[PDB]
Design an enzyme around this catalytic site. Structure first.
Site, short mmCIF file in Angstrom:
data_model
loop_
_atom_site.label_atom_id
_atom_site.label_comp_id
_atom_site.label_asym_id
_atom_site.label_seq_id
_atom_site.Cartn_x
_atom_site.Cartn_y
_atom_site.Cartn_z
CG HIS C 62 -1.96 -1.09 1.12
ND1 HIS C 62 -3.29 -0.93 0.71
CD2 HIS C 62 -1.84 -2.37 1.57
CE1 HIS C 62 -3.92 -2.09 0.93
NE2 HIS C 62 -3.08 -2.97 1.45
CG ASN C 135 -7.58 -4.32 1.26
OD1 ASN C 135 -6.88 -3.34 1.49
ND2 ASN C 135 -7.09 -5.57 1.20
C1 HDD Z 1 1.16 -10.27 8.09
C2 HDD Z 1 1.08 -9.09 7.58
C3 HDD Z 1 -0.09 -8.51 6.91
C4 HDD Z 1 -1.31 -9.11 6.51
C5 HDD Z 1 -1.75 -10.56 6.59
C6 HDD Z 1 -2.08 -8.02 6.01
N1 HDD Z 1 -1.42 -6.84 6.07
FE1 HDD Z 1 -2.06 -4.92 5.67
N2 HDD Z 1 -0.21 -4.17 6.06
C7 HDD Z 1 0.85 -4.85 6.59
C8 HDD Z 1 0.87 -6.19 6.91
C9 HDD Z 1 -0.20 -7.12 6.61
C10 HDD Z 1 2.04 -3.98 7.01
C11 HDD Z 1 3.36 -4.48 6.51
O1 HDD Z 1 2.16 -3.94 8.46
C12 HDD Z 1 1.57 -2.61 6.46
C13 HDD Z 1 2.51 -1.75 5.67
C14 HDD Z 1 2.38 -0.33 6.24
C15 HDD Z 1 1.77 -0.45 7.53
O2 HDD Z 1 1.47 0.45 8.35
O3 HDD Z 1 1.38 -1.77 7.67
C16 HDD Z 1 0.22 -2.92 5.86
C17 HDD Z 1 -0.53 -1.91 5.29
C18 HDD Z 1 -1.91 -2.01 4.90
C19 HDD Z 1 -2.69 -0.85 4.50
C20 HDD Z 1 -2.25 0.53 4.25
C21 HDD Z 1 -2.65 1.43 5.40
C22 HDD Z 1 -2.27 2.85 5.05
O4 HDD Z 1 -2.92 3.43 4.16
O5 HDD Z 1 -1.26 3.36 5.61
C23 HDD Z 1 -3.99 -1.37 4.29
C24 HDD Z 1 -5.18 -0.60 3.85
C25 HDD Z 1 -3.89 -2.77 4.57
N3 HDD Z 1 -2.64 -3.12 4.92
C26 HDD Z 1 -5.07 -3.64 4.54
C27 HDD Z 1 -5.01 -5.03 4.81
C28 HDD Z 1 -6.16 -5.87 4.83
C29 HDD Z 1 -7.57 -5.44 4.49
C30 HDD Z 1 -5.66 -7.15 5.08
C31 HDD Z 1 -6.39 -8.44 5.24
C32 HDD Z 1 -7.65 -8.47 5.65
C33 HDD Z 1 -4.22 -7.04 5.24
N4 HDD Z 1 -3.88 -5.71 5.19
C34 HDD Z 1 -3.41 -8.15 5.59
#
Ligand code: HDD
Ligand code: HDD
Ligand code: HDD
Ligand SMILES: [Ca+2]
Ligand SMILES: [Ca+2]
Ligand SMILES: [Ca+2]
Ligand SMILES: [Ca+2]
Ligand SMILES: [Ca+2]
Ligand SMILES: [Ca+2]
Ligand SMILES: [Ca+2]
Ligand SMILES: [Ca+2]
Lengths: 675, 678, 452
Positions: C62, C135
């Site tokens: 993202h 999402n």
């Molecule tokens: C095991 C890790 C993992 C898993 C299974 C998911 N994500 Fe995530 N997500 C991350 C690890 C992550 C992260 C690496 O922690 C991020 C990158 C930036 C942050 O703050 O978190 C991230 C960012 C991130 C952002 C951007 C937020 C922003 O605008 O700053 C969104 C909208 C989502 N994710 C949504 C989802 C949804 C709807 C998931 C499943 C239902 C999902 N993620 C599963």
């Protein structure tokens, strides 16, 4: 060598942690089969912590780019002009790594943005790493490094909304250009086809700054670095570049990658202009001023050696993302000049690696290591990968027998500052008045382009300036453009509905210089790697046969051929749905496919009109185009049979012979209207 | 060295930059001989940038410590109790690295602070790195990892002024101890001589938590790790420790370094208690509770193998500073338990290396690398050293033929969680009531000490609690100590001028357990490396002769001999000006130097009364002391030391002197010299 | 602005250093008018050091996105189903910040790539920050958070040459999809027009996971979050999206920015499906499985309140780039489920902020701060902005009179885990067989689309 030692093979074996304990990584450990995940799942946490921390800051400029390995080979023993060890013998080979780039865009921005481009070359010499951190344009926007954040804030997206990506086509950029007239020269270059090169292989490299070559007797001369492409000079047209940014943001990196994989690694003659110290002001401008070129009529190029890129990286992040260039990576036989742009760069490139790497030991990453032993008293720091055996890392010492020994001009092949250099005068924050002509050279450059090239430059400015919202900025832009050329100012003003200021002839002139025009540089010296799209159909076995026949004939000559049809099958590479004219340097329709080009042709397999739009786009963008089989197609496109670069032959052989001449011509510029 | 591939030699060659360009580094580049320095001086800025960036965050706890390389050797094939590869054959050797430490002090704090001590061992096994991250005390202050910041904030300096360094002798610490009774068991240990060990070599290591040994058939047993010193147990006394902190802050690190350089690398038997899963609650307490020991009378130690440290590091920062231990560095054959202290540690030690290292590739530092291949899909991150060939680092894949393959119980020698483990119940933030007896085991420990040892423990508490400003806090302290022992509360209370509360016998008892007393652990099994100071004079060539004779005889037996005199010369190691009783395990005066012990003796070469003070301090701290040569009354009388005292030696014969004096070194401390509360 | 306290005005005044010394910044200090630059030029070095250090790591996923401020307004007192304070009264308003995004592309990649999109919403509640990190597609590609690096490696560019940007149209992605059939449901959504929305305002937001609503009396119900667009649903066509990626890589962020500036700030009804705990397996699939939707025919939407975005940021980097969302930003009245994808997320988002911020005090950034007091014993760390007056930051203490006090179900409005939750069984690394139908729901979705 440091790269080979750190290569990790994962073609066999069981999954392990980073400490070699065999593990799994597909299911979390849970308290019951529908239960919550456990904190004690170290397999989960180590894999996800690694993932969570994958990213590093992108480079503050030139964030978007791509790299390759190769070799530099000296043509001679250049001891007569420099002590540099990499240049001290005929045939001496030095490994290199080059990274090419845009400037303004972030990571993921498109390759085919209009911009200045980087051309950064590392020579892993036997007397240390030597970097020439250059651009594809020989002059810089600004005259003092302290202004770099101003320039870069202005061109980068507006900071309230971060719009627009990878573009100077906004108020702030043109506000800066109009207020800081030093920018004119590079501006004119960026608004030419040099801002939208066809590939990294079809552009040159420049050090920009005057540097010094220093001999072992202490004497020095002034030099400019030019890397001259052996592939020829070629550009896109703007309308093509814009579509290509959408259709393939990776176009330049893929073109590079592909050329290397096919055994067509790109080459450049590494050259210098060499002039005497006494000629610092002799050419009508100051050699310390990075907004000026030395016209080749005043100082010819000497060919020092061959640069060849011939090996792609194994891991992009480890190699290309982590390469940390510095103009401070200098070797004995080279020295700096008092160019205030260069002078400040030396600070920036050492400091910024701390941001990228997060710690001080960035020269230990394999891509940044040298190929000679390191002997110094630098110690500790986060990420320290050495185990130093010298327990008295201070100078002077007796307890380590006075090692390491100091190196200097007299002994140890030490770097030394050119000993003829001096300074005199007050400690000042003042610009030399020798730097004040901001307009004559922009006019020199503009004068040296062909008429259609001048038109393209005008049209680039018309495009960008018409997107500036501020009427005052637009007026101030015309004020500056008018100092270069009244005609440019008038022609640009007409697109934006303003009147040009009255002519101000202070800097006008009719002088030209060789070697700056793309359109004027003659046919390309090779067509190997250029791309031919053959538009065919699966309907007619005749169409596929004609396509195969052309394929064999074109492939023999090193062209990359794509046969496009409605659907994939043996001999068809690409569906119409995924094809675009931006993917080809020339387009051929086999006459057996004529039905697909009719206005009523329609298929659920590709967008309405796609086959014809490939052909028409290719023609409008200047490309060689034709029909092979001896009519309907040329008329459906409104493409004239008599036009230069339009081919119409029943004979496959005659077609290919004529068509290949048109690929070397590369662009048919008579298809573009003039003012 | 096991890290030789990473070594950089600078015994030859010309100075270079980090990119191999020969340079100089002694004068700045300037605009004229008396001019300003230039920005273009890259030599200057690369050098100074490196200097400016040398430091890394110290460890959040255990910041003060020292390490060494060595080798573990298994005594047997232990495959009938654990699948752990490093234990799978008689004689099997595994490289190790060990770091010892205090807990509270920052970097630069003194080794001889009163504290808990760390003992952290890495085994670089053929199936991955396995770390046992232990302490010299077998029980921990707290029963849930979530409380660790509370404990550590309370013991570390007060955060307005950052005072006091490396000490629990302040209000906050004793506030926490009195409010959180779990702390009593480790507090009693820290207030014993275990809080001030003689060296790292003279202390044991404990894993503290119950772990599991897991066989290849998936069956498990519950284990405790116990690294038992083959040097013996020994302590300082507090009055000595305080001086030593000032005279030699590096005493424990120097002792270790020196023992390894002399070929006397320290050894431990690596042992376990082994019990069945059904015994979790059989011993009168819960084996999930890290404030409890299993008495050796209920479960004997099994010796698994030998740990020997025999090689010092080449670069302290690269090897000792950078070593990053984790209880998550586990191997097949070992598993966790549900001890809430252990469970949360697993999180902390992976996270905290991000702070230390500044990036996620800390396992790539030489000292952290395994000695076997790494095959995984971890990628990128700051500082990435590897150049991964596999361009399809995801599972499941076909484009890399399904490699790396998943490893588990049945394939690839994978780690697996013990398959008998289960969980049941509500998801809760509550403490098991099985953990609520905070006081019986502290009393068990106290009961197990000798009478002088119990006095020392009471005196440590008197010392610390007298420095607590808050009368409230001091009364609350007495309330808790009283629950362990009324006699302790009374005797502590007396020093601080409060009354102890009335006895509360709920947890009082007379049980004892073996193996926790230092004073009661009998003479040391070896005297090699112990330090003998010989106090001599340059004024009498016969005193130097006497010293030289004693040197030869004591060095024969592996003692470290220092001859002290007014000035240096051949055969004299140290001056009186730099000598101190804290520098020695025993002190011998040669009777040719008697004149230096008179009240009137003075020199510009050392502080007034220094020779005599060395002898008096050594005597008063319990050490073997004596006069060699036959004339002893002038020195012993000046010192108020009785010729008939235990651990006081007087002999004309050098041989007889040494024979007797060596017995005293093994006895180590003469505890009859300390007063007892009636 | 809600962040007005932290704003810095430069519409007047003389240039200063960061420590308030007036300076210049246009010419370097040199030994002579054509001379070398001096190391003592602090003006140059402070300016260029800041420039050199402007960038921070992009988000691991993202990375490409844009945000805005607004307000959430409750339609009722939802005390009946949740203790959540922000939902406890009709008309109650809570400030919000929302970021929308793509998934795979880096910074600078085009808005109109075909991808899943993020929709992350922070409610700055009077009982703490509460984030719903969603999402625009209601189902996720995978069933266990441990698999996230595998998915993401496979969809991001091939790692030898970092090609292609912002695209699933490459071997590695389709390799992963075809070997991990869980991916079918999301894949069908992403290959629909939901992969190329017309704007962020013309898409919905979904929490994906089942969460719990928890009342003050401890009882709980199972919920799914749906944020339903009041602008309507609309997509681009793929040929159009491809050209638009070249002509205007900023199209979605501009659309949003312009809508707010014109007084047309976008709106969503914040809705939930609300089912009993006993219905976890009742609908023909497991509510713990994030690759399944509850069909609306089985559980209708309840409208909770209105989300309106109506104020653009002042500084994109400070506000949009720096906002650090977490599913662990939860409030009393909400709880987690044992969805193995959610469970592992909780770890990731706290950890990853250390990479982005470079230190542990990232909740002190203005955009991350709460709008209520903070009382805890967290201390020190790089970048520490607070000056803590309590010099006894441990519990239990007497020396600070036992403050801060512990908060829990019965005191101080504490968060509490839903007390009916339990766990049973072996400690296992095994997938529930209840997760095994990867194909019916994709077919359900496909069947629901019109012929074109
Ligand atoms: C095991 C890790 C993992 C898993 C299974 C998911 N994500 Fe995530 N997500 C991350 C690890 C992550 C992260 C690496 O922690 C991020 C990158 C930036 C942050 O703050 O978190 C991230 C960012 C991130 C952002 C951007 C937020 C922003 O605008 O700053 C969104 C909208 C989502 N994710 C949504 C989802 C949804 C709807 C998931 C499943 C239902 C999902 N993620 C599963
Ligand atoms: C005072 C600052 C400053 C100034 C005046 C310049 N640059 Fe620079 N340049 C940087 C500060 C910088 C930097 C912030 O230090 C970068 C970002 C990443 C890095 O390593 O250095 C950089 C990167 C960078 C790269 C990318 C290297 C790579 O591929 O990793 C190139 C090719 C150039 N620059 C070329 C130039 C040229 C030809 C200049 C004028 C003749 C120039 N820069 C002026
Ligand atoms: C919840 C946190 C937590 C708890 C409950 C403990 N520790 Fe710990 N420990 C850490 C958090 C920590 C840490 C912050 O993660 C350190 C700092 C440096 C490091 O690598 O880990 C650490 C360092 C550390 C070291 C230094 C290792 C070295 O020399 O580098 C030792 C020996 C211990 N600890 C031993 C223990 C023992 C025996 C514990 C109880 C049985 C214990 N710790 C509980
Ligand atoms: Ca602008
Ligand atoms: Ca052109
Ligand atoms: Ca205190
Ligand atoms: Ca003792
Ligand atoms: Ca398992
Ligand atoms: Ca691929
Ligand atoms: Ca950092
Ligand atoms: Ca709870």
């Amino acid at each position: 060598s440091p790269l080979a030692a750190y290569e990790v093979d994962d073609s066999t074996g069981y999954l392990t942690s980073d400490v070699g304990g065999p593990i799994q990584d597909q299911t979390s450990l849970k308290a019951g089969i529908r239960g919550p995940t456990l904190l004690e799942d170290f397999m989960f946490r180590q894999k996800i912590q690694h993932f969570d921390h994958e990213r590093v800051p992108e480079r503050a400029v030139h964030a978007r780019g791509a790299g390759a390995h190769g070799t530099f080979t000296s043509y001679a023993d250049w001891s007569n002009i420099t002590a540099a060890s990499f240049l001290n013998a005929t045939g001496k080979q030095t490994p290199v790594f080059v990274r090419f780039s845009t400037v303004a865009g972030s990571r993921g921005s498109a390759d085919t943005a209009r911009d200045v481009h980087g051309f950064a070359t590392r020579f892993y010499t036997d007397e240390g790493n030597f970097d020439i951190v250059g651009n594809n344009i020989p002059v810089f926007f600004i005259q003092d490094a302290i202004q770099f954040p101003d320039l870069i804030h202005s061109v980068k997206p507006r900071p309230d909304n971060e719009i627009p990506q990878a573009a100077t086509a906004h108020d702030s950029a043109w506000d800066f250009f109009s207020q800081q007239p030093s920018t004119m020269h590079t501006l004119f270059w960026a608004m030419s086809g040099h801002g939208i090169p066809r590939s990294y292989r079809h552009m040159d490299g420049f050090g920009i700054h005057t540097f010094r070559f220093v001999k072992d007797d202490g004497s020095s001369k002034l030099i400019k670095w030019h890397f001259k492409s052996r592939q020829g000079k070629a550009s896109l047209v703007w309308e093509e570049a814009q579509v290509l940014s959408g259709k393939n943001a990776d176009f330049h990196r893929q073109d590079l990658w592909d050329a290397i994989e096919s055994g067509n690694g790109p080459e450049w003659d590494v050259c210098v202009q060499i002039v005497d110290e006494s000629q610092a002001q002799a050419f009508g401008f100051d050699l310390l001023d990075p907004t000026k070129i030395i016209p080749e009529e005043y100082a010819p190029l000497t060919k020092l050696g061959l640069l060849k890129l011939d090996r792609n990286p194994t891991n992009y992040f480890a190699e290309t993302e982590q390469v940390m260039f510095q103009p401070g990576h200098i070797v004995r036989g080279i020295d700096f000049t008092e160019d205030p742009l260069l002078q400040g760069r030396l600070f920036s490139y050492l400091d910024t690696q701390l941001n990228r790497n997060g710690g001080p030991n960035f020269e230990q990453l394999p891509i940044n290591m040298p190929r000679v032993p390191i002997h110094n008293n630098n110690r500790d720091g986060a990420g320290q990968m050495f185990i130093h055996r010298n327990k008295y890392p201070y100078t002077p010492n007796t307890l380590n027998s006075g090692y390491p020994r100091q190196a200097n001009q007299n002994a140890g092949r030490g770097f030394f500052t050119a000993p003829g250099r001096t300074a005199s005068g007050a400690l000042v924050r003042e610009v030399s008045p020798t730097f004040n002509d901001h307009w004559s050279q922009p006019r020199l450059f503009f004068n040296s382009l062909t008429p259609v090239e001048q038109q393209f430059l005008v049209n680039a400015m018309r495009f960008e300036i018409s997107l500036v919202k501020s009427e005052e900025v637009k007026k101030n832009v015309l004020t500056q453009l008018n100092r270069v050329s009244h005609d440019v100012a008038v022609r640009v003003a007409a697109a934006i509905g303003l009147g040009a200021p009255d002519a101000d002839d202070t800097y006008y002139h009719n002088n030209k210089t060789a070697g700056v025009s793309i359109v004027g540089s003659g046919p390309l010296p090779t067509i190997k790697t250029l791309r031919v799209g053959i538009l065919a159909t699966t309907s007619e076995s005749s169409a596929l046969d004609q396509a195969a026949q052309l394929r064999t004939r074109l492939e023999k000559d090193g062209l990359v051929v794509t046969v496009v049809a409605e659907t994939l099958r043996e001999g068809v590479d690409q569906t119409y749905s995924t094809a675009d004219a931006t993917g080809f340097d020339g387009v051929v329709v086999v006459d057996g496919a004529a039905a697909l080009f009719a206005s009523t042709a329609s298929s659920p397999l590709f967008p309405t009109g796609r086959p014809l739009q490939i052909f028409v786009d290719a023609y409008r963008w200047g490309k060689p185009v034709g029909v092979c089989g001896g009519s309907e197609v040329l008329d459906a496109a409104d493409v004239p049979e008599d036009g230069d670069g339009v081919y119409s032959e029943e004979s496959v052989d005659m077609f290919v012979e004529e068509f290949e001449k048109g690929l070397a011509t590369f662009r048919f510029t008579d298809r573009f209207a003039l003012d």
